[PDB]
Design a protein around this ligand. Structure first.
Ligand SMILES: [O-][O-]
Ligand SMILES: [Fe+3]
Ligand SMILES: [Fe+3]
Length: 290
């Protein structure tokens, strides 16, 4: 009947209040955020957009990730404002640039080309990738065929199916970043232990953006052969906090007892982004058990 779209907007505003309340536990605000991401619409976009006020770089970058995945052009102005806001952490600005790419609307090409020259290397790289993704979409007439993951990725998977040839492409520092990302998503889609370990070798090369992406796709693939390397990266205090956070999230997704021990080990880490990732990951495991 017609009460459906009243009930949903009530639930949206309620969840929204939970998200923007800085006194709610972080795991509760993540839960609100991902529910809004699923529900979608203008109310949802506004409440997510309102949370960019927050102190947590972890939370703010998830906001931007969610707006990207929502693929709703209504988010574009807010994501531009985040991308341009030089006071935002690199991780946050990177995520807003990627999100502009994910929405796939060419209206944003000119800004993405501009920010391909941003002084913050994560941002520059992210926007280079997003310009190539927009160019790909334009040449192919839309998103690639749906693969095994429902995510909207920063690059379409490479056509090559041989894992060994994909590994070579991934680890080649002379190839363009976009081509390397394509081989990375093809590895993830190939699956199995050989591809998991080939991916995990990428935790020792490229830029910090590249390594973080490796972390994310290892968390999506969820293959346990990668745990030791994900836990070792998490443990490396010299590693970039954005990479260590992504590794922690991956460990969170896999959620095997050994992942859970590594996350507890780092729950008092000095890097706020790393502590909060471990918190949220452990809290989700506790929820599930309950
Ligand atoms: O982006 O971590
Ligand atoms: Fe990211
Ligand atoms: Fe991240």
């Amino acid at each position: 009947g017609p009460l459906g779209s009243m009930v949903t907007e009530q639930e949206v505003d309620a969840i929204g209040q939970t998200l923007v309340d800085p006194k709610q536990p972080l795991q509760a605000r993540f839960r609100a955020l991902f529910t809004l991401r699923g529900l979608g619409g203008p109310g949802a976009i506004a409440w997510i957009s309102q949370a960019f006020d927050d102190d947590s770089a972890l939370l703010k970058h998830e906001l931007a990730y969610c707006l990207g995945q929502m693929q709703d052009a209504r988010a574009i102005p807010m994501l531009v404002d985040v991308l341009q806001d030089t006071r935002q952490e690199p991780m946050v600005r990177h995520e807003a640039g990627e999100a502009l790419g994910a929405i796939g609307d060419p209206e944003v090409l000119e800004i993405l080309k501009q920010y391909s020259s941003d002084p913050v290397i994560e941002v520059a790289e992210t926007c280079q990738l997003a310009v190539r993704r927009l160019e790909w979409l334009q040449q192919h007439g839309g998103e690639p065929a749906a693969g095994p993951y429902l995510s909207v990725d920063p690059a379409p998977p490479a056509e090559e199916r041989d894992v060994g040839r994909l590994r070579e492409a991934l680890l080649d520092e002379s190839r363009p970043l976009f081509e390397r990302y394509r081989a990375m998503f093809a590895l993830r889609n190939a699956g199995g232990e050989e591809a998991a370990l080939a991916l995990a070798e990428g935790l020792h090369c490229g830029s910090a953006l590249f390594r973080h992406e490796v972390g994310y796709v290892l968390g999506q693939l969820q293959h346990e052969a990668a745990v030791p390397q994900l836990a070792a990266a998490l443990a490396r205090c010299t590693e970039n906090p954005m990479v260590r956070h992504e590794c922690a999230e991956a460990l969170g997704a896999i959620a095997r007892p050994a992942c859970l021990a590594a996350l507890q080990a780092h729950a008092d880490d000095p890097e706020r982004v790393v502590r909060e990732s471990c918190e949220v990951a452990l809290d989700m495991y506790e929820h599930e058990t309950g």
